């Protein structure tokens, strides 16, 4: 549902390539992206799953 | 144009490639059954490979050992990416031979303008995507602490220092977090944080290891 929700992804500033999701509100779906290890944002999901039930509706 | 090149097949015999079901880190050994990388590595369920080139075929040189524990140093700040440092104990201990060896630590600090040898199979492109199969090398010299602090305002501590070329181009990306830098033989930084990779007057930072060494020594031995 929400407004962190449509934000894009961030990586951020570390080195790691960790794989997780993000709502893509244009596809309507739940993605993935590469994630930095560090200062994540809100739109970062460990599982689509928890993705789509934080996000999906946005 | 690439910065760095391929190092070969198994001639960084130290490197470790940190897996959870795909490559996310890497690290250096620094015994049969120790390895360090960076805090922000961190994860359940890792995985060790030792003994690789292309990480994703099985080349038959490989060790793929479990951790047993993980120790992120009790001081890191997920916000200041300060004190950046963890080891992680096998499960077993490796077996060591000329594909598979540790990497000294160091009795001193490096100074500026000493030439090292950063290794990882992180991204090869500035902007953009390309993770290589194959284990790449950059020959990369340490930057004064002054000249750290000017390109990152504010935010380097004591454990940080830069190393890299402030025209751009060749530097440690995505996938290379917690993997070595080697300088003279000795184990002095370990892969970290940057503004993107790559970019003109930024750098990447490092973690420090010459202040860690009383640390990391009585870590593993009392473990
Ligand atoms: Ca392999």
């Known amino acids: ?58 | 144009i690439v910065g760095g090149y391929t190092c070969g097949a198994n001639t960084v015999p130290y490197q470790v490639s940190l897996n959870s079901g795909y490559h996310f880190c890497g690290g250096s050994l620094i015994n049969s059954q120790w390895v360090v990388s960076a805090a922000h590595c961190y994860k359940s369920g890792i995985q060790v490979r030792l003994g690789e080139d292309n990480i994703n075929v099985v080349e038959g040189n490989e060790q793929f050992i479990s951790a047993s524990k993980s120790i992120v140093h009790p001081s890191y700040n997920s916000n200041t990416l300060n004190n950046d440092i963890m080891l992680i104990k096998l499960k077993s201990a490796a077996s060591l031979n000329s594909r598979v060896a540790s990497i000294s630590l160091p009795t001193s600090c490096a100074s500026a303008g000493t030439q090292c040898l950063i290794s990882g199979w992180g991204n090869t492109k500035s902007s953009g995507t390309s993770y290589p199969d194959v284990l790449k090398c950059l020959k990369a010299p340490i930057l004064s602490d002054s000249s750290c602090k000017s390109a990152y305002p504010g935010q380097i501590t004591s454990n940080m220092f830069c190393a890299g070329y402030l025209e751009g181009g060749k530097d440690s990306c995505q996938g290379d977090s917690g993997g070595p830098v080697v300088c003279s033989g000795k184990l002095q930084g370990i892969v970290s944080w940057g503004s993107g990779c790559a970019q003109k007057n930024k750098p990447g930072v490092y973690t420090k290891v010459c202040n860690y060494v009383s640390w990391i020594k009585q870590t593993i031995a009392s473990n």
């Open chain 1, 1 to 58: 549902r929400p407004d962190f929700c449509l934000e894009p992804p961030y990586t951020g500033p570390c080195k790691a390539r960790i794989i997780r999701y993000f709502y893509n509100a244009k596809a309507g779906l739940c993605q993935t992206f590469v994630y930095g290890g560090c200062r994540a944002k809100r739109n970062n999901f460990k599982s689509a799953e928890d993705c789509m039930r934080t996000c999906g509706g946005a």
